[PDB]
């Protein structure tokens, strides 16, 4: 990879096999250091009720035209601050996040999309990453409903990257599940707005700056229709209290905590290699486990995902073939990565030690 935004981070990411410890800010902008296995706003979220006017049967406010709708790309602190001030006047906002996971161990949030009743925003989470805590007054606000579609990943990403926590989250995917119907975003936007979403950039590289026009359009359309979908879902839940239930299930989701990826040195390799372990000798299983565990350690050290360090087929290839020279380790898996070529002797020592260990 050309891009490596982690190098620009104000604080280096801790990929160590130790529990995640949150560093978060309150609505006053006061920094706090949290505790492992403790969500720092659990007592707040459990003590906060859904705004009563948000449980009333109301008429929908249509989404605007994409042609004349204001779109703002926010990538400075002042711009982020001005946006936060705009959001503190709303009773509901639509939020989405774009993420990167290949050239990062834990992964990091790349972009944040926000739509209000009258406009759209795209926030550069990479550029203003160190200042995202300024959004806490909005995300902690009990009178502001934060609408997300399929918030399981988002809730954790907000915590991992920014120390951001949602008070009065409403998940539109949970709403669709409770109505017993298809619950993807593309489905919701098509069923209520009669618009077909792009889907082309679902797997794009969100680290690219500048963001091309088509990607800006994709990012904007992910939240632009969401408050209308929210209005439509409220009406459906109020007649056939089910609306209240969805708010209660959404609150339970906002109570989830981010947990760093865990390497179980005796389990994870089995889960990733599965039935491919069949037909391997005791020594080949030892090399399979040991190299997979090396791969994870190297990924944590280089701040890359295990797949960026070495393809899984390459782990199986070394386990099967048992290479006994540096060149044989290199030749085992044709597209030789940078991490593998530099630690070729350590991978070779794993093989040599496993065939040495038994016979």
Residue numbers in the entry: 176 to 415, 423 to 541
Task: Quote the study's own text.
The exosome is a 3′–5′ exoribonuclease complex that plays a central role in numerous pathways related to RNA processing and degradation, both in the nucleus and in the cytoplasm. The eleventh exosome subunit, RRP6, is a member of the DEDD superfamily (DEDD-Y subgroup) of divalent metal dependent exonucleases. Rrp6 is composed of an N-terminal PMCN2NT domain which was shown to interact with a cofactor Rrp47, the EXO domain containing the catalytic active site, an HRDC (helicase and RNAseD C-terminal) domain, and a C-terminal region responsible for the interaction with the exosome. The EXO domain consists of a classical α/β fold composed by a six-stranded β-sheet flanked by α-helices and the HRDC domain is constituted of six α-helices.
The TbRRP6CAT construct crystallized in a sea urchin-like form composed of very thin needles. TbRRP6CAT crystal structure was refined at 2.4 Å resolution to final Rfactor/Rfree of 16%/22%, respectively. The model covers residues 176 to 541 and includes 185 solvent molecules. The polypeptide chain was clearly defined by the electron density, except the residues 416 to 423 that could not be modeled. TbRRP6CAT shares 41% and 40% of sequence identity with the corresponding catalytic core of the yeast and human proteins respectively and, as expected, conserves their overall architecture. The T. brucei RRP6 structure shows a closer match to the human RRP6, both proteins presenting a shorter linker and a more accessible active site. TbRRP6CAT is the first RRP6 described up to now that was crystallized with the native catalytic site DEDD-Y comprised by the residues D271, E273, D329, D397 and Y393. In the TbRRP6CAT crystal structure, these residues exhibit a configuration similar to the mutated active sites of the human and the yeast structures, even in the absence of metal ions or nucleotides. The apo TbRRP6CAT catalytic site shows only moderate movements of the side chains comparing with Mn/AMP bound Rrp6 structure, and a water molecule that is coordinated by Y393 and E273 residues could represent the hydrolytic water. The electron density map revealed the presence of a disulfide bond between the residues C496 and C515, linking α-helix 3 and the end of α-helix 4 of the HRDC domain.
